[PDB]
Amino acid sequence: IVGGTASVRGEWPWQVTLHTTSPTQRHLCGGSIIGNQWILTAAHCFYGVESPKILRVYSGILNQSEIAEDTSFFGVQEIIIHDQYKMAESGYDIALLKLETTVNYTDSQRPISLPSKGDRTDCWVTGWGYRKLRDKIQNTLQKAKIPLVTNEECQKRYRGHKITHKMICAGYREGGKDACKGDSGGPLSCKHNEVWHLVGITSWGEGCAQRERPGVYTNVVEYVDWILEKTQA
Ligand SMILES: *[C@@](O)(C1NC=CS1)[C@H](CCCNC(=N)N)NC(=O)[C@@H](NC(=O)[C@H](CC(N)=O)NC(=O)N[C@H](C)c1ccc(Br)cc1)C(C)C
């Protein structure tokens, strides 16, 4: 997260930190709780990830230093990637994680409502990623208010990339506030009528918070059907 501020403990209940044990443990990507045993995130986060067994999910986290070898975590029973995914920059950068055990909701971990298809503004991108292109994972969960930018507006900034309707861009004309390396998979949460909705999944972008370079996110509303299909028994 570039140009943001440290969050408060429990400020973003759905946000979780995904770790990989190979070759050694470390933050891998962001993620959103959306059900007892369902974590939503970006598909590109599992490039070269063979077994779901190397994945460890931590919810209710504020600071990475809350995580040590003796720290509890939810095991990942299954990794479901969208059958059309290929490159994050081509779309379908969405994936589901089915946790080994059910999640007990508390003040520090609750799910986030999926946007209503009937809805095809007050948005924030959160994460523990870089503060600038070259940097390091942040200990304290970062957050930043970013305005959504139309696709026609996005396409222009990306004359080399084709921004479909399954994508949505957010950023500032001037930059300065955007997600960066390590925020991937993480949520773009927007609040309407004081109800949060998972509008986007951090996906890609040229650099971080650069002028006229909106961050490209997966447009979640375009996948709820896919989601209900995968979450179903
Ligand atoms: C995620 O946090 C990560 N996914 C995997 C590792 S880190 C970032 C979020 C990017 C948000 N950007 C923004 N709002 N400005 N995603 C990526 O790094 C993805 N790639 C890219 O965003 C860009 C796309 C491009 N056309 O350049 N690629 C890129 O930065 N590539 C270089 C090679 C790179 C440098 C450092 C790191 Br840690 C990764 C890649 C994924 C790689 C698809």
Side-chain angles (χ1 to χ4, degrees):
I1 298 301
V2 182
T5 56
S7 303
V8 189
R9 180 167 293 285
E11 175 164 26
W12 311 96
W14 51 95
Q15 170 93 60
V16 308
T17 173
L18 315 170
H19 280 36
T20 169
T21 60
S22 228
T24 44
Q25 201 162 312
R26 51 80 146 180
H27 170 57
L28 174 59
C29 277
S32 299
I33 293 173
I34 60 183
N36 280 197
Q37 62 182 180
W38 300 106
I39 289 295
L40 190 69
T41 187
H44 82 266
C45 284
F46 310 101
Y47 167 73
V49 163
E50 198 64 335
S51 171
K53 237 85 178 194
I54 53 186
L55 305 181
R56 292 181 170 189
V57 180
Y58 301 85
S59 69
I61 305 300
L62 167 56
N63 300 136
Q64 292 287 133
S65 34
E66 279 175 42
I67 294 171
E69 194 65 57
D70 67 342
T71 297
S72 70
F73 65 73
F74 285 99
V76 174
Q77 175 170 299
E78 193 186 327
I79 295 177
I80 305 186
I81 289 179
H82 200 292
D83 87 289
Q84 279 168 41
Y85 174 69
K86 300 161 174 179
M87 312 291 149
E89 312 173 85
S90 287
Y92 301 91
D93 184 24
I94 190 172
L96 279 171
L97 299 178
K98 189 178 184 183
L99 308 193
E100 289 178 61
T101 62
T102 292
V103 166
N104 22 35
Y105 299 141
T106 53
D107 293 302
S108 56
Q109 36 191 281
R110 78 181 193 68
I112 178 177
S113 310
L114 293 171
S116 174
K117 283 178 62 185
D119 285 356
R120 304 215 295 192
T121 306
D122 186 58
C123 310
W124 298 68
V125 65
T126 61
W128 285 279
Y130 290 13
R131 294 169 298 146
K132 65 192 201 293
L133 195 37
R134 57 172 196 165
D135 183 50
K136 301 198 190 308
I137 302 305
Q138 298 312 310
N139 181 56
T140 306
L141 180 69
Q142 298 298 293
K143 71 194 188 80
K145 166 128 162 296
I146 306 294
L148 272 35
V149 313
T150 62
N151 280 50
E152 191 193 299
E153 162 73 317
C154 201
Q155 188 55 90
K156 174 158 299 191
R157 303 317 181 204
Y158 290 83
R159 308 159 286 273
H161 299 89
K162 168 72 203 165
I163 308 293
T164 81
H165 61 287
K166 291 193 187 297
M167 291 169 189
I168 49 83
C169 315
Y172 284 107
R173 221 274 183 182
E174 62 264 34
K177 288 196 172 194
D178 184 34
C180 202
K181 310 315 184 189
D183 294 302
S184 278
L188 175 49
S189 332
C190 309
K191 178 188 56 174
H192 88 64
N193 290 118
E194 289 46 299
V195 176
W196 290 94
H197 283 274
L198 181 55
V199 171
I201 306 179
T202 300
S203 192
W204 60 277
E206 188 62 70
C208 294
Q210 306 201 74
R211 161 183 295 293
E212 321 189 318
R213 292 296 203 169
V216 182
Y217 298 70
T218 296
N219 185 14
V220 181
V221 66
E222 292 297 309
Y223 294 97
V224 319
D225 301 60
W226 179 76
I227 294 175
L228 304 176
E229 180 188 320
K230 290 307 173 188
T231 60
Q232 165 187 171

